[PDB]
Amino acid sequence: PTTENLYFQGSMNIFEMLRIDEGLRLKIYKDCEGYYTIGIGHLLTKSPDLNAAKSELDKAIGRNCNGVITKDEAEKLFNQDVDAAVRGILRNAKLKPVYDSLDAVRRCAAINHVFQMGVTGVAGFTNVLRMLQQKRWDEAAVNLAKSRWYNQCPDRAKRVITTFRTGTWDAYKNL
């Protein structure tokens, strides 16, 4: 690894990670599951009604957006969504002990998974959680690859799974 490569881990964090997995869009769009989304993976609603999604957007941003936001607004909403995912893990009696047992990079993958799926969805992955606590990284990754989360939308989930296998940032290199 070159001096520069050893620097790459100092450049990666949860925000850079989810920015790569979710992308950055300033106008309402439908995600791989057809749900209305904006900014950096902010799901607006599961409703098929774009009017509901615009309604949620104006609530979330606090102004009349008509389906469009700024980069700074995207970043603020993203920061809030990351904070909610971390808070959701830390207050949960099932997820917290597993999170605490993980190294820093796998902790980012855990916050990413919760950002994407929500607390109850993730907390239902009983086998994977046990595998992760037991440092069975290959098995955890194979099991995550059986999930509907990954299989319905592999490009958004694949790097998180690789990160659970390896505990490094390699999946985020060389975009």
Ligand SMILES: C#C[C@@H](O)c1ccccc1
């Ligand atoms: C299952 C799983 C992992 O994404 C995870 C592990 C610990 C806390 C939250 C999520």
